[PDB]
Design a protein around this ligand. Structure first.
Ligand SMILES: CCCCCCCC(=O)OC[C@H](COP(=O)(O)O[C@@H]1[C@H](O)[C@H](OP(=O)(O)O)[C@@H](O)[C@H](OP(=O)(O)O)[C@H]1O)OC(=O)CCCCCCC
Ligand SMILES: CCCCCCCC(=O)OC[C@H](COP(=O)(O)O[C@@H]1[C@H](O)[C@H](OP(=O)(O)O)[C@@H](O)[C@H](OP(=O)(O)O)[C@H]1O)OC(=O)CCCCCCC
Ligand SMILES: CCCCCCCC(=O)OC[C@H](COP(=O)(O)O[C@@H]1[C@H](O)[C@H](OP(=O)(O)O)[C@@H](O)[C@H](OP(=O)(O)O)[C@H]1O)OC(=O)CCCCCCC
Ligand SMILES: CCCCCCCC(=O)OC[C@H](COP(=O)(O)O[C@@H]1[C@H](O)[C@H](OP(=O)(O)O)[C@@H](O)[C@H](OP(=O)(O)O)[C@H]1O)OC(=O)CCCCCCC
Ligand SMILES: C[C@@H]1CC(C)(C)N(C(=O)CN2C(=O)c3ccccc3C2=O)c2ccccc21
Lengths: 457, 457, 457, 457
């Protein structure tokens, strides 16, 4: 029995020289790395095509429909006078009507199809305001019914009015322009793929929710991919996907067999004992990782086949699945380096250090979260790097690693002459956080890790 | 007696299993964390509304009143010819007079109300120059009485001259335009709050104090919030604030009772001894922190209630109080992790290391301050990162942490061809500071911290 | 025999006091450092002249031929309407025809010389489209023969039509403008060199391969250097090159003699032994480095002489050879510091640490490569820092060293509102990579290096 | 005798309790810190005034005389057509002639005064070209006499032609415009100082030395300060300078007396011995530092008095002297912390570590210099961060500290498609340098420093 357990925990070379076992799993792992990486790159080709089409069309729409737009001005593009706003709205509508004559792309109009478009209408120009608004700052008084009323003007695409629009400025909530355009992604021909039919839903927003005299203007698009009706293009990916599936399936079967054998050996040993952690010694975590990677790879390959068959269009989900599977396949090869001490430093140190590291992180995390919330709420209105909770976490994590420090300090230097108390608070906040986390938290973290390494040295 | 002292220093679980004590303070701490964080976020909503209103109105004013203004040009916006300055001034006044017809916001005029406006005057256009100025650079001579004379033209808002302004360029100190606008912060309705009435005091400055042929132009605003006169809006925060106050009060009472018990036990022990540091062993600093946090939270909640009641408008003070209280509430939960060694590494190391760290910082601080002053005065006129003492401290602290180094070096590369001696001095200054502080000071600092950790390992 | 081996491993001073040997190699090394560095700088003069000529001419071409071009707009310069594209094309052609009257430089036209220019034609204006293209997005259908058809209009340079161009927009692949200009690099006279004759091949591309309504416009140049036909300029570099060659040749001969002596001593010792690593003890790696440096220096000097003689024009290859040789010459002087322990810390630590460091890097590299591939494919379409594999490696290597962290996080903040799943994946990817590599991999790497140092301490 | 030496090495408190000695030097040091810092700030006021005047006048000149100039365009401002160059030159001359009517500043003209101005001429417009230039790129030939010929047109300032200029474009070396303007720095009145008279020498350069079709345009100024002739301004710095001088003189005398006493004690001890390093134990380096600081402070104060007296105008030299003296005064206070071990960690570690650190730097410096030269010559023409040797050193030093890594990599990504060999070389160069210096050099440096600290722990 003892020899059986000794063989169970033996390296591939030792196992071979003991029982002449062929190391099929190692060669399978190498082949998997190669084929999975190649498949990921091949998929990335089509993913890039789709993304490029969407973003390039969006940029073209911004240049076509936004009056006076230039690249890099997205977050400051705004109107400041009634005349500017009217001109921008009319420019957008006029460009929509003139698209077939001026645009470099080939677009088709879409009519009807539910709200906000009536039947036969291509463009909806809607203004939303308050049901009752009387604003008299001269008398410091107002009378408001905040229920929002929407008034929409319908414009039919030209056959191959909106100029009377009167905006209720003092109670205006916003103005929106909605329309849809159909186009074809011809560039797919370069990848020997049949072009898809795209529908872009375009929304242009003139936002007055702040009632501050400045109305920002933005353009957004939603892309819907569809198979074209009986297209025609004059005159091995499926087989490669099948090969990937076969390799992953064989690897999954072998790993499952190994896991079952380990479970049976664990049962036999426990029986021969006439605990839990001692039972986990028989569970190969690397093989759990391998089977998870195989499942992810097979699911991603099926999704990729479906997308190429035009049954699906979830490019992002497929990309995430395949990329995660590729990373896991690359990582899984360390299972065989684990057998040799000189090549196993990282894994051994991680194993020894994880408990204390997690316990330390438990205590550090509450301080981190307190700082996150405090900065988010107090400094967010004044600091571009504290606008949202996730952004605050990113900024603080970067500061812990010594990145982007002076710019973080400098962003607040504008408030020194206007909101001095907030500036002083920001000084204390930033100095205390940086000192505490760089000099105390990180030092102890590295000390724990290096002491764990010293243990297994 | 000894058993009493032993119990006094026992963990919540040990205390429970000894005397069946319910750990009310721990549950109170958890509830406090939750409710205080929620309160901070809820307050942040209104804080953001107010700040957004102020800044957006200021940006709109800059676009409305500054001729040729564009975003991002604030620190270089200037006039360079007499005609440009006259056009800018007249544009500002004309836009002030045309505001009701062109602005997207709804503004009301303010008249009189003391200097610099006379009764019935909405806008004050003032030029300040020298009482006697005769400047003859051709003869290298001048005759100056530096007493400043102010001449103001009053403009009444239009009923629903300044064009004869003659600037004394050779002795002109500056030109200012002052006016006030009233508006209403309608966006508050989205938060189910009654809109406030804002008065913006707008100051436009054309600054010629340098007499250098370049006159920078700036716009600044001061916002005053007030309750509107009998407003009308058609059809649980107070209760949540009350709940926060109740939780904080109960926590304060429990902590005070614990502190009193500790003080009584300290007195009894000293009496049984038939020093100072030995007495401080009976003072729970965590409970001092907790009572301070409770006081801050209660004060912030009272201020927030007052602001919501429109009795106050000090948003920044309330935000600082509540954010600091939230951070302290999050930190205070470590008092219970302190009882377990594996989770107490950070606090124990801090306790052991603070004295030596402070002694080391004492010596390092004088070198830091010498560098700060030297850089501020020598390099400040030439380096954008050394303009002020606080900016110098920020730059040097970032350099200590390895941040923003090459840009700091590059800012001086422009003076290599013009002021070479200053450039060489900057080379020596920067190299010496970086080497000394990164390689010697920081190494010893981390060594002290890690040795202290080794002591408590 | 033992004394012979002892003397073989003796330092230059010890060798001199033993046998009165003159340390010629050390003096040769110092002289080599001096002369090789001087030669590198002297070559850099001409290299800079050539590179400046090319780049400045390219910038001038961009300003001359691209309608509305401005500096810094290269990667966003594009057309968005049919009229803009026609105007840009016609502007390029008209400027090509008007060059002799408007350009600040002096250029000559080139005619014929093969495709795409016919005989006597200076400019080729070609449009490439699909052989058959019928695109009907209204009916969601198309009929495409993707064979590319090129149609070219030839323009002869003016004697000292293209306006009828009709673009097939719906099936247009791209438009190109090809022409060549001849000029003379007169600035070489400042270096006392005869000016060369340059031919610039200019390609202007209007790219429509994405069919997205946005057509980027770019200009590229290829420079061909040639000797001018019998030029005339009115009224020691070769000798310095000869001196460098002589010094390197003598150093090479001495190093080869030393290596032969070491090999013979190794043979004698092995014979007196009546393994491999023991044999390598007799091989001076520093002398292998020195002979390699001598070969590189001699080859670079020959190439430099040929370039100055106008027989060659491979400035980049010569620069790389000479710079690498200079670096190796500077490095080789450490061979003599190696004899003294206090000055040999770095080399001794490297010797002791290299095996373990390489073994560690073996395991770390697979994780690094998995991350590289995953990021390249998943995030490349959305992140400017992940566009290519080399860019991904640069970004990840910078992140390992704590550089450019917050900007990497912020680049993805735009996808939070639009592609949230990809944003969440990017969050996990970046956080996991940074934590794992900064806190675990780097800590162990430094620990291995410092332990190796402790061994030789 | 032994007691005398024991007293010689005794702390101020111990010395006082032994012989009742008053610690005058310590109080003098504190007073020196205060007064020297205050003096530095007071001087910085005037230094800032002067620097601001110069820079603001230069910016105003750029906006006045450069056609189409805008802020931030200095390094790309250039002309690209003959018409643009003619318009820029004529605009500069016309603005010079129209200055009295358009400028916001008040300037006086300067006539004659030697080359390049003839008697009575205010502006010199010179073109420099080749004596003989025949350039025929069509025939690939030229005939050049590179002797430079200058032709100058003189323009007299308007009483309160150059339009016939014909540029020889094909052999033009450059065009320059020279003129001088006199003005008065009135802002000094705010500091209660008499305004100085400034003469600005303005040089505008249109540079064609590259003959590349692009002519960059630049403006530079030289400022000369002078005392105005009998100025008149209607109705304690000297005393503070005297106080600083008195304090520094007393400190210098006390330090010199202490040094003499130490020297005499050293002589007596050596005599009682009936080496060098043992003699250096009697030399107080802190007092050498103090006397050097006193000399610097006194010289700076004298120079400052002279500048305020208008006998000198060397603001930069005075600022450097005073700032260095302030830094040294702040540093010198550590002499008294040196007596206590807990506060003497830094100095003791530096003393123990300096020899080994210097020996290590000796070996590292040759590698650093090899990299510097190689990068400067090979990558300088292609990389904005490698243009000059000092800039290369700054970039490499920043990279050693992990700063600005990704941007350094990205600057070369433009050459990947054009000069691929140089790009690959840059890849190898940057990766090798960063790895070697961050992971090996710095680790050993910190290890040496921390081992030295461990010695004195
Ligand atoms: C009698 C029990 C029930 C029936 C079992 C039948 C099994 C059968 O036939 O093959 C098993 C091997 C396993 O191949 P593979 O998994 O590479 O090899 C096994 C593992 O090394 C395992 O250790 P771990 O890797 O640590 O889990 C070890 O215990 C097994 O020896 P042991 O059996 O003495 O315990 C090995 O056989 O499979 C192939 O080597 C590829 C076959 C396909 C080749 C063509 C591919 C296109
Ligand atoms: C006889 C002396 C004078 C009268 C004293 C009357 C006291 C009374 O009644 O309760 C005290 C407890 C304290 O609750 P709490 O503070 O959670 O618990 C105490 C602490 O654990 C204290 O240690 P530290 O935490 O280290 O300071 C410990 O010494 C006390 O035991 P000891 O008394 O044997 O010394 C505990 O009672 O209060 C509640 O547990 C919540 C009550 C409100 C529940 C409803 C809330 C809505
Ligand atoms: C008898 C054997 C065959 C014939 C050999 C004839 C050799 C001859 O003549 O000179 C050799 C020396 C070598 O000069 P150099 O290489 O500087 O010096 C030798 C090295 O130090 C070598 O050790 P490593 O440096 O560790 O390899 C050492 O073993 C040799 O001693 P050893 O001979 O007792 O073993 C030295 O002679 O050359 C000159 O010092 C410059 C001559 C040119 C001066 C003018 C320049 C313009
Ligand atoms: C007999 C020898 C020749 C005549 C010497 C006459 C000297 C005289 O009169 O004063 C000396 C002291 C020195 O003052 P000060 O330098 O502060 O004090 C001396 C130092 O502490 C010195 O040690 P280090 O600091 O380590 O070098 C120590 O050896 C001397 O004692 P010792 O003499 O027993 O060796 C001290 O007198 O001066 C004042 O304390 C300020 C006087 C001005 C006060 C007004 C200022 C406005
Ligand atoms: C927190 C910081 C730690 C350490 C880096 C050791 N340090 C200095 O090196 C010098 N130093 C200052 O004196 C200072 C004042 C204000 C802001 C920043 C700094 C600063 O960095 C130091 C010294 C004293 C107190 C704290 C510290």
């Amino acid at each position: 029995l003892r020899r059986r357990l000794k063989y169970f925990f033996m390296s591939p070379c030792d196992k071979f020289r003991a029982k002449g076992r062929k190391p099929c799993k190692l060669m399978l792992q190498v082949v998997k790395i190669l084929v999975v990486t190649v498949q990921l790159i091949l998929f990335g080709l089509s993913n890039q095509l789709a993304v490029t089409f969407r973003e390039e069309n969006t940029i073209a729409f911004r240049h076509l429909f936004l009056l006076g737009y230039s690249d890099g001005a997205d977050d400051t593009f705004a109107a400041y006078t009634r005349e500017q706003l009217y001109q921008a709205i009319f420019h957008a509508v006029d460009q929509y009507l003139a698209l077939p004559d001026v645009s470099l792309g080939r677009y088709a109009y879409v009519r009807g199809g539910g709200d906000p478009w009536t039947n036969g209408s291509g463009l909806a120009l809607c203004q939303r305001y308050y049901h009752r608004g009387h604003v008299d700052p001269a008398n410091d008084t107002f009378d408001i019914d905040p229920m929002v009323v929407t008034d929409c003007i319908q414009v039919d695409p030209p056959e191959r009015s909106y100029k009377n629009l009167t905006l209720k400025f003092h109670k205006l909530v916003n103005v929106t322009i909605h329309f849809r355009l159909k186009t074809i992604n011809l560039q797919s021909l370069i990848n020997n793929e049949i072009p898809d039919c795209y529908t872009f839903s375009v929304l242009i927003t003139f936002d007055n929710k702040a009632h501050s005299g400045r109305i920002p203007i933005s353009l957004e698009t939603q892309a819907h991919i569809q198979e074209c009706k009986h297209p025609s293009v004059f005159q091995f990916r499926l087989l490669f996907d099948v090969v990937v599936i076969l390799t992953c399936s064989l690897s999954f079967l072998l790993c499952a067999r190994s896991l079952l054998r380990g479970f049976l050996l664990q049962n036999e040993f426990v029986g021969f004992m006439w605990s839990l952690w001692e039972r986990l010694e028989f569970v190969n975590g690397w093989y759990i990782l391998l089977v998870t990677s195989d499942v992810l790879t097979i699911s991603g390959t099926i999704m990729k086949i479906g997308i190429e068959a035009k049954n699906l269009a979830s490019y992002d989900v497929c990309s995430i699945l395949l990329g995660t599977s590729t990373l896991l396949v690359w990582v899984g090869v360390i299972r065989y380096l684990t057998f040799f001490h000189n090549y196993n430093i990282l894994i051994a140190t991680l194993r020894v250090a994880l408990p204390s590291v997690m316990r330390f992180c438990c205590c550090v995390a509450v301080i981190y979260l307190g700082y996150c919330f405090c900065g988010w709420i107090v400094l967010g209105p004044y600091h571009v790097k504290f606008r949202s909770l996730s952004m605050v976490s990113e900024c603080l994590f970067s500061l812990i690693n010594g990145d982007d420090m002076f710019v973080t300090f400098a962003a607040m230097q504008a408030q020194q002459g206007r909101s001095s108390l907030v500036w002083l608070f920001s000084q204390l906040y930033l100095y205390s956080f940086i000192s505490l986390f760089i000099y105390m938290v990180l030092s102890l973290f590295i000390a724990l890790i290096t002491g764990a390494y010293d243990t297994i040295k």
